[PDB]
Amino acid sequence: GGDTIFGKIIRKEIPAKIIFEDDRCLAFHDISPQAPTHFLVIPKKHISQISVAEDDDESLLGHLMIVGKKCAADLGLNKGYRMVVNEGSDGGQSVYHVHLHVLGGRQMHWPPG
Amino acid sequence: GGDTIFGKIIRKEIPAKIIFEDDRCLAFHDISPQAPTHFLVIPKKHISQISVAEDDDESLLGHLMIVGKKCAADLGLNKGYRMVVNEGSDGGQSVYHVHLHVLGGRQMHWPPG
Numbered sequence: 001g002g003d004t005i006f007g008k009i010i011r012k013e014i015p016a017k018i019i020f021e022d023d024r025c026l027a028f029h030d031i032s033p034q035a036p037t038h039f040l041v042i043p044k045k046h047i048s049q050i051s052v053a054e055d056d057d058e059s060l061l062g063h064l065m066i067v068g069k070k071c072a073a074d075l076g077l078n079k080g081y082r083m084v085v086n087e088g089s090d091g092g093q094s095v096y097h098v099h100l101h102v103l104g105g106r107q108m109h110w111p112p113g
Numbered sequence: 114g115g116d117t118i119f120g121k122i123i124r125k126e127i128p129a130k131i132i133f134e135d136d137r138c139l140a141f142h143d144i145s146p147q148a149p150t151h152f153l154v155i156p157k158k159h160i161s162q163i164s165v166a167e168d169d170d171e172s173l174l175g176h177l178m179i180v181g182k183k184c185a186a187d188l189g190l191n192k193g194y195r196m197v198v199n200e201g202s203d204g205g206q207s208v209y210h211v212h213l214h215v216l217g218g219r220q221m222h223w224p225p226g
């Protein structure tokens with residue numbers, strides 16, 4: 001689902017510590033975590049960045065989060081966590097396939113970067 | 114609606130520089146801005162934290178995101194931005210009512226807190 005490394009991972013072309021999968025997304029642990037628990041929830045539809053998402057991707061986008069809070073519960077993150085979507089340069093996006101970051105396992109700080 | 118500060122704002126007790134509103138959500142500038150452009154998007158129905166959210170609130174959550182991107186774009190955050198949702202303790206939540214954070218203007222750093 002796309003011409004980025006997230007696509008290769010979705011296509012099972014390369015490995016990722018896969019956490020959850022359904023027909024429209026895939027959750028896996030970040031290869032370079034910034035917290036004890038750091039995983040990603042990505043959709044299989046190739047949306048490059050959130051600013052490019054359609055009104056018609058609303059449920060899908062909400063699914064990513066739904067999936068996000070579920071998988072967090074199942075990783076023993078009962079004390080809280082932070083969810084992050086980055087858009088472009090200023091935002092710090094590393095891969096141009098939209099995705100949700102879920103980080104837990106320590107105190108997250110303010111500001112959020 | 115709500116008991117919280119955000120319930121007070123949904124019910125116009127205290128004003129807010131409203132960027133957007135609809136039947137489902139409300140977007141307003143943050144009074145403790147962490148970047149040049151820093152705004153919040155809360156749903157009008159009371160969900161206090163993301164872990165108590167049902168699969169039913171999926172499109173409403175995708176909607177906060179869709180509106181988030183709309184507003185960032187309407188407030189001209191063309192270089193990028195970052196959306197952050199805070200969960201419980203570890204997440205740094207004090208305001209117990211679901212809310213999407215949108216930050217822009219400056220370069221956002223990694224890790225996100």
Ligand SMILES: Nc1ncnc2c1ncn2[C@@H]1O[C@H](COP(=O)(O)CP(=O)(O)O)[C@@H](O)[C@H]1O
Nearest residue numbers: 110118129142143144145199205206207208209
């Ligand atoms: N009257 C208000 N108008 C706009 N934003 C507000 C108001 N009161 C509180 N907020 C904002 O609520 C946001 C914080 O919510 P949380 O992320 O859940 C908790 P914390 O600030 O402890 O990290 C802050 O950015 C703060 O400025």
